[PDB]
Design a protein around this nucleic acid. Structure first.
Ligand code: ZN
Ligand code: ZN
Ligand code: ZN
Lengths: 117, 376, 1178
RNA sequence: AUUAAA
């Protein structure tokens, strides 16, 4: 069984696999205000130059960010590519809890923000 | 002031969680062909896990008569709520208020999430595109704003010199129509923010506008008694028809997603339904609003069921083909109900009234004695 | 882009059943229908239902009824099809198919009243006196068909236009004992639902409208208006008592026109919900919400409750026949039923879509009745989930086969009838031993003094004799003509003697010793049946031999006028007297192309077919046919079949009676078998593993099986390649086995595997679980199946949220209270070696925890030489109502090898729960992506990395309302939403980002999602609530997709059934294509095979020709049936069931259609047979 | 950090 065993696709190079790798049919992002933070990382921008500064539909990311974005988890990240906080799901990178650090002990033990003591 | 930096005791909030209903429906669909194979939910409190969402009970739209009060969501600003809209996946409720702010309430536990000063003038219109990307809002100052799911304003332009009452998207969302107090409907190109046509002929304030689900038709309602309802061709800009449907001030025009029905609410205390294929004769007339009928909302799942709001605060429920109201709450709000929004699963209804609060209504639990203030 | 749909397994599951005169007025028949299937059953007296006729429709039956028309020899069948279609059909003598008398369409937009979505199935009802039939259409239009050219023009009644404004019709039944056809309608003028009962209680009403056929007037008589809100079906009481019995969920009502209503309360749940006067029925605490009932005799009703319990309800009456009381008797429980009908008195059929439909026999006890199961019709239930795995018992001789050896395990049934079905398409022999015997090409096994004593081999110039017994050894002793080849060898008489024929002559054997030998162009083919021996020379000379007791073979030259050369022969004995005019028959084919049947003791012609080789659909009395065989099969060899081999093409005929000539005709039966020293391809066998049938040799060996059920079964056997010759073999070392050669010259001594049943469309083993089977997953390592099962227990507590922790309210009610059913979920371990559950390997979940998903996931690990490890992952949710927040758990289990418990070899396998932790939301879907676990938790999709025993969050993305299904290929995830649509997601490893590539913007209630794989094209196959199959493609450069952010559907197909599970296999032109298989919720298995554009266009012209130029059952339109959701459209999927009609046509019809569509029959046949060949898996 | 605790 195990479809991966009987019906393997590793030897097949799919068209959409080429399309996403070559950023195929990616129209420039209209309305320079928006950000599209749920988009893929621009692989063209990683290698060298994309040629679309802010007009690219895909994320032009930077490695200096260390703390995860609290608004991105809530789905309200307005900054987008100009966001200083990491759009990753690393729990170690979570910001420290405002209430545990200052207001003694946090109300809910289920909060994702880091507790220091 | 409130800034998310104040300690308070942990609260376990009231929830209307649709997940148990969906899971139960996912199990039933496996072995039940349709409603006739569905085992009956008993009117007892112990049958809490047999409930399914409205998609499960397609043959009985009476489930979605949501007269069970859940929660009242009021801002600390305490200003009238003019428009309520659900985020397309039902994650959040967004309310547009007279202060011009957007307030976001969690779709499961209906508590405050965030607030943002969206418009300078009262928010009159709020609509999401057919693709879930875009939320278009208009204000009393005549400005139209473009938003996304992250509530980031992207584009701003002034569509009308007077108050914009309602906006409606085309099926492909490439174009939309706005109605204003200047008396004209205007067709816009979404991507270029350019007005394609100006639609003139009502002669008074245009209070509502709707786009046909598939055809490319625009229906408008106005204060003008001579031209209460008009049909337009958004490409040519021409007036296809005029419908003398109401005596006074058609407040809402909603085209059913089936593409056949026009639902009109007016200040003459009447909601009327029309077949757009045969406009000369009026279909069912809905009577039962003691005061003016101000808001209507077709159910997302049940195509014949819709909720209606009144200027007295009454929230009534109607079905196509049924003469009388299938349900209602005469004192749902203390003030005129401005907008009604259904959750994408039509199990929760939200109402924003001229009173400074917004309320959430869910389906009645099987086996409960509806002796509360809103029922008996 | 292009594909062809084929069904590999016909749907199983019956929704309608009735007892009517299908064939003639002398006997009644059990007529049952399912999803696009019609079955006619006879009752053979142990009692067994044997199939008499089966028909397929291009549409799903929505309602079934029968009427006896004026001056008719049969009952016409009234079949209803989705939307507004009524088709009146009869059985046709002559051509053994159905005959469409009238087809009615009521599909006008005016009748729909502006409601585009149809939620009401069309329901046909028949007057008891046969005066008229009524079909309720769209819930508002009542179509009336008057009966007396047997039909009068129909008219439509708008029930809204009637008095009292019905407006919500629950049930409608014609009433007995009226001068005019009186239709009782149960309806809700004002509708309510359980939950608003406090403000709207008594909502149901009945009206009896008297239908005047001529004046077309229909006044209302006998209105009642305060019936309980939860009134389910109503049933019309027969003539003596009359009236109607109304089933309610919690109460039972008897209503009559004059008598005041009589009603009883079935449980204490009627108290605050019904103001109707109800009297507590004593000793019964039941519910009638989803119950099937039928009247046995009068004043007695058998009711099949939900849960399967059977009750006998008695209407207790006074002398003047007024119902004054109800009597309830609880008889034995049985299957979950969808329909019920009474056969001959004492017999009751329980039609079942969930579990096996079974025939019951009830007898009065020594008022009360006892029920026993006499027969059961196998039902692969609603196929919730399916798992592919490899069978454990493949013989060592087939281990080096290049194609994978694999089977299907299906979660079937529901509740008490929940089961696992093990499905194998092909038969796999269990080889006992192999003999390397080259040169010999044909075999014969004969019984000697009922084991087979001798095995006779024919070589090119010699004959080899093997004495089979305790040891199989060659006999060099005399008796058998080993000098040259043998044409045929068999048993003559009653197995007392052995008959051996060579080109030189015919030899009679007592065993090892020869009794006598008779010398006799060389003999090329011999036919032996009973004391009759017929041999044919190369030039067509025919002589017959007869056993005359002294025994001895006696020469009797047949009187035959050779206007044409005889090219093949057959002998047949008719045990069951279908061959009316133990009798003996000779079947003969001439060179001109004529087929002749002869009374065998004499030689008078009885049957004649003018153009036999062309393959006519029906053979009626008055090229190069190679082999012909008549065999009687079934119970006591009742139903005979004709087997013909012409031009590398197999065509096989069923025989049916039809009135000094033979009162029989032959009907062509469809199949998908292609045939692309005279050696017989058809080898009749009796009692191979207790099975009687014929083995077809050749490039595609097949098993033809007909049991007492009477259904033709065709099972392929291709694991050993083409089979040259075949013979039955009953031996001490080979009990009721068989014998065949491989093409390499290997002789196989084999037996049929015992764990499978071959009386189904596929070899199947059904494992009863007595509980609902939700998900099944195959674990490659440890080679076991994990099954997520749930069982129902009474609910005793109502969870509450008090703001601090969960607070449980104990349900305190009366003794007459029906407790709600609460599901308890378990994950079990099933061994393929012995399909019993593995002991002490069972995971029990929490009290309210529901398995929402369970899959086998390959997660990367550093243990094996590869990366992936292959665990079993389950997603759960605690279902505690709307008021309580739903949260879930992710369970990752490994099946490990351990030393088995002494005396329990099955206990070598055991769960190892590596991860079981509470998640921050409901876990609704699970998947794996490049060694990472992908979970839909609430309105987000998370991607996890599995550490030693911890799950590490890698990335997430915000998703739609409720993701109930995810499947991944490479680094792409296809997520299905319950209401919104499918979504396409990609994960980038270098930057831990999960993004949305594209999605379908339109709403869609998706059932399940898979992939369509081409050489480079990837399609997202989607199942829908409206029973549609959609293929979506990611086309960023296409204009219709705005920037690639819209997924575009590129192929559309309406399968008649819901699909919840998908799996794909490689094709057996097809370099990188994968066949996507699916199991339907109606018990069927279907295919979606990718196709080239040119072949698609050719077969599309063929499909249009077959749609236009061929009559179809019930007059239905094949093209309209496969249209999208109309029961926009992108017709790029061919209907292989329609394309199979080309194979069913005669050669002349095929050629005419090919010239009309401007192509070659050879080209069309090549395309069709290639599609059949590449999909020969399982 | 844009109201994380409304
Ligand atoms: Zn870029
Ligand atoms: Zn951010
Ligand atoms: Zn904290």
């Amino acid at each position: 069984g195990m479809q991966e065993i009987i019906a393997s696709v590793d030897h097949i190079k799919f068209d959409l696999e080429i399309a996403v790798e070559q950023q195929l049919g990616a129209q420039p992002l209209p309305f320079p205000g928006m950000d599209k933070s749920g988009a893929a990382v621009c692989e063209f921008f990683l290698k060298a130059a994309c040629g679309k500064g802010g007009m690219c539909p895909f994320r032009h990311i930077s490695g200096e960010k260390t703390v995860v974005c609290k608004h991105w988890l809530r789905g309200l990240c307005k900054k987008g590519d100009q966001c200083e906080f990491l759009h990753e799901y690393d729990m170690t990178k979570m910001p420290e809890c405002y209430f545990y650090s200052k207001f003694g002990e946090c109300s809910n033990k289920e909060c994702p923000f880091l507790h220091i003591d | 002031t409130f800034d998310g930096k104040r300690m308070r005791k942990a609260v376990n909030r009231k929830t209307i969680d649709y997940n148990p209903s969906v899971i139960k429906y996912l199990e039933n669909r496996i072995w039940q062909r349709d409603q006739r194979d569905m085992r009956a939910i008993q009117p007892d409190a112990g049958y809490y896990n047999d409930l399914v969402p409205p998609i499960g009970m397609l043959n009985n739209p009476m489930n979605a008569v949501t007269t069970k009060f859940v929660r009242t969501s009021t801002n600390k600003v305490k200003c009238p709520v003019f428009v309520v809209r659900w985020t397309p996946e039902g994650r959040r409720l967004v309310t547009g208020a007279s202060s011009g702010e957007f307030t976001l309430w969690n779709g499961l536990t209906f508590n405050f999430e965030t607030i943002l000063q969206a418009h300078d003038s009262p928010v009159r219109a709020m609509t999401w595109s057919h693709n879930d990307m875009w939320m278009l809002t208009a204000d009393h100052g005549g400005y139209v704003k473009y938003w996304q799911s992250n509530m980031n304003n992207v584009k701003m332009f002034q569509a009308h010199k007077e108050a914009i009452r309602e906006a409606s998207f085309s099926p492909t969302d490439n174009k939309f129509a706005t109605c204003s107090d200047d008396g004209t409907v205007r067709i816009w190109d979404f991507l270029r923010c350019h007005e394609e046509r100006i639609l003139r002929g009502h002669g008074a304030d245009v209070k509502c506008v709707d786009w046909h689900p598939t055809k490319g038709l625009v229906v408008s309602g106005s204060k003008d008694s001579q031209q209460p309802i008009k049909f337009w061709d958004p490409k040519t800009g021409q007036s296809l028809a005029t419908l003398h449907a109401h005596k006074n001030t058609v407040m809402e025009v909603k085209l059913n997603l089936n593409g056949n029905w026009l639902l009109t609410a007016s200040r003459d205390h009447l909601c009327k339904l029309f077949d757009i294929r045969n406009l000369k004769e009026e279909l069912q007339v809905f009577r039962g609003h003691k005061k003016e009928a101000t808001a209507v909302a077709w159910h997302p799942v049940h195509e014949g069921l819709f909720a209606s709001g009144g200027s007295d605060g009454s929230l009534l429920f109607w079905h196509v083909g049924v003469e009388k109201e299938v349900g209602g709450m005469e004192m749902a709000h203390e003030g005129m109900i401005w907008s009604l929004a259904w959750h994408p699963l039509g199990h929760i209804l939200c109402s924003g009234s001229n009173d400074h609060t917004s309320k959430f209504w869910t389906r009645n639990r099987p086996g409960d004695k509806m002796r509360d203030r809103y029922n008996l | 882009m292009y594909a062809v749909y084929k069904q590999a397994h016909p749907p199983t599951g019956l929704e309608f059943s009735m007892y009517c005169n299908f064939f003639n007025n002398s006997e009644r028949n059990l007529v049952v229908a399912g999803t696009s299937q019609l079955y006619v059953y006879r009752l053979n007296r142990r009692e067994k239902l044997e199939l008499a006729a089966s028909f397929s429709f291009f549409g799903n039956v929505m309602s079934m009824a029968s009427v006896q028309l004026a001056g008719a020899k049969r009952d016409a069948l009234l079949l209803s099809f989705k939307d507004a279609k009524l088709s009146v059909v009869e059985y046709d003598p002559g051509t053994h198919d159905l005959k469409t008398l009238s087809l009615h369409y009521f599909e006008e937009p005016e009748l729909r009243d502006g409601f585009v979505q149809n939620v009401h199935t069309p329901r046909v009802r028949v007057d008891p006196d046969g005066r008229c039939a009524a079909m309720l259409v769209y819930g508002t239009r009542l179509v009336v068909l008057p009966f007396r050219s047997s039909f009068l023009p129909s008219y439509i009644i708008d029930v809204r236009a009637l008095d009292e404004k019905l407006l919500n019709i629950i049930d409608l039944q014609f009433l007995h004992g009226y001068y005019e056809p009186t239709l009782l309608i149960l309806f809700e003028p004002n509708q309510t639902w359980p939950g608003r009962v406090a403000v709207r209680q008594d909502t149901c009403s009945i009206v009896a409208i008297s239908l005047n056929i001529t004046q077309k007037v229909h006044p209302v008589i006998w209105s009642l208006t305060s019936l309980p809100f939860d009134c389910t079906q109503a049933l019309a009481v027969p003539k003596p008592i009359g009236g109607v019995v109304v089933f309610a969920v919690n109460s039972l009502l008897y209503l009559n026109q004059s008598v005041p209503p009589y009603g009883v309360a079935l449980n204490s749940l009627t108290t605050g919900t019904t103001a109707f006067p109800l009297r507590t029925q004593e000793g019964v605490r039941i519910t009638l919400d989803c119950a099937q009932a039928t009247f046995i005799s009068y004043d007695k009703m058998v009711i099949s409750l939900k849960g399967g319990e059977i009750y006998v309800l008695t209407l207790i009456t006074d002398g003047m026949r007024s119902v004054r009381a109800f009597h309830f008797d609880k008889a034995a429980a049985s299957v979950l039923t969808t329909s019920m009908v009474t056969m001959e008195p004492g017999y009751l059929f329980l039609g079942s879509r969930l579990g096996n439909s079974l025939l019951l026999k009830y007898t009065e006890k020594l008022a009360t009745y006892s029920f026993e199961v006499c027969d059961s019709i196998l039902n692969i239930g609603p196929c919730a989930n399916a798992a592919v795995g490899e069978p454990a018992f493949l013989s060592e001789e087939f281990q080096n086969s290049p194609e994978p050896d694999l089977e299907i395990v299906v979660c079937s049934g529901h509740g008490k009838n929940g089961a696992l079905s093990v499905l194998q398409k092909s038969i796999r022999p269990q080889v006992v031993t192999t003999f390397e015997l080259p040169g010999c090409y044909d075999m014969w096994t004969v019984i000697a003094p009922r084991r087979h004593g001798f095995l006779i081999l024919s070589r090119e110039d010699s004959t080899m004799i093997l004495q089979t017994g305790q040891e199989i050894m060659e006999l060099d002793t005399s008796g058998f003509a080993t000098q040259g080849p043998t044409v045929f060898a068999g048993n003559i008489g009653d197995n007392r003697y052995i008959v051996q024929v060579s080109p030189l002559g015919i030899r009679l054997l007592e065993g090892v010793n020869q009794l006598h030998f008779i010398p006799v162009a060389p003999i090329v083919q011999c036919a032996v049946a009973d004391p009759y021996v017929v041999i044919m020379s190369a030039e067509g000379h025919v002589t017959m031999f007869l056993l005359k007791s002294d025994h001895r073979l006696a020469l009797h030259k047949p009187p035959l006028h050779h206007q044409s050369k005889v090219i093949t022969l057959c002998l047949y004995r008719d045990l069951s007297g279908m061959f009316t005019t133990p009798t003996h028959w000779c079947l003969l084919v001439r060179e001109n192309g004529t087929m002749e049947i002869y009374q065998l003791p004499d030689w008078r012609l009885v049957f004649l077919v003018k153009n036999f080789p062309v393959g006519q659909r029906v053979l009626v009395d008055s090229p190069l046919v190679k082999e012909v065989l008549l065999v009687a099969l079934g119970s006591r060899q009742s139903r005979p079949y004709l087997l013909v081999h012409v031009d590398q093409e197999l065509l096989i005929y069923e025989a049916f009676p039809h009135d000094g000539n033979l009162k029989v005709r032959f009907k062509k039966v469809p199949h998908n078998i292609n045939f692309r020293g005279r050696v017989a391809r058809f080898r009749y066998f009796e009692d191979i593993y207790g099975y009687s049938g014929v083995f077809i040799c050749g490039p595609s060996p097949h098993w033809l099986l007909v049991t007492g059920r009477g259904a033709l079964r065709l099972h392929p056997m291709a694991i050993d390649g083409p089979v040259d010759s075949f013979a039955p073999f009953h031996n001490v070392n080979c009990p009721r086995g068989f014998l065949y050669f491989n093409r390499q010259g290997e002789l196989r001594i084999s037996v049929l595997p015992a764990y499978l049943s071959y009386d189904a469309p596929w070899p199947v083993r059904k494992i009863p679980l007595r509980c609902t089977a939700h998900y099944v997953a195959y674990h490659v390592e440890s080679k076991v199946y994990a099954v997520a099962t749930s069982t129902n227990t009474p609910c005793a507590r109502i969870p509450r949220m008090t703001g601090e922790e969960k607070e449980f309210e104990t349900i305190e009610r009366d003794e007459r209270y029906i407790h709600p059913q609460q599901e308890a979920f378990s994950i079990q371990l099933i061994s393929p070696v012995s399909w019993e559950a593995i002991p002490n390997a069972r995971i029990e979940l929490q009290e309210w925890e529901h398995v929402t998903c369970m899959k086998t996931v390959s997660l990367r690990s550093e243990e094996t030489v590869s990366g992936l490890k292959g665990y079993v992952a389950a997603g759960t949710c605690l279902m505690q109502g709307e008021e309580v927040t739903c949260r879930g758990r992710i369970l990752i289990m490994d099946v490990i090898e351990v030393v088995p418990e002494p005396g329990q070899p099955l206990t070598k396998n055991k769960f190892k729960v590596l991860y079981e932790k509470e998640q921050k939301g409901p876990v609704t879907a699970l998947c794996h992506c490049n060694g990472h676990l992908v979970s839909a938790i609430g309105q987000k999709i998370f991607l996890w990395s599995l550490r030693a025993s911890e799950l590490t969050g890698m990335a997430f993305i915000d998703t739609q309302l409720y993701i109930h299904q995810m499947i991944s290929v490479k680094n792409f995830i296809l997520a299905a939403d319950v209401m919104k649509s499918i979504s396409l997601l990609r994960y980038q490893e270098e930057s831990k980002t999960l993004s949305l590539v594209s999605r379908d913007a339109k709403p869609l209630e998706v059932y399940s999602v898979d992939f369509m794989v081409d050489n480079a094209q990837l399609g997202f196959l989607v199942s829908d609530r409206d029973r549609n199959l959609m293929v979506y493609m990611y086309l960023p450069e296409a204009k219709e997709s705005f920037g690639g952010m819209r997924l575009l559907r590129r192929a559309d197909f309406h399968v008649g059934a819901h699909v919840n599970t998908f799996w794909r296999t490689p094709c057996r032109v097809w370099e990188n294509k994968h066949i996507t298989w699916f199991a339907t919720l109606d018990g069927g298995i279907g295919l979606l095979l990718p196709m080239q554009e040119k072949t698609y266009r050719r077969l599309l012209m063929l499909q249009n020709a077959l749609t236009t130029m061929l009559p179809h059952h019930a007059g239905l339109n094949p093209r309209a049936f496969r249209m999208l959701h109309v029961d926009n459209a992108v017709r790029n999927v061919l209907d292989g069931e329609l394309l199979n009609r080309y194979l069913y046509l005669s050669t002349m019809e095929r050629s005419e259609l090919a010239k009309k569509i401007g192509t070659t029959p050879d080209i069309i046949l090549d395309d069709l047979l290639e599609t059949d060949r590449v999909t020969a898996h399982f």
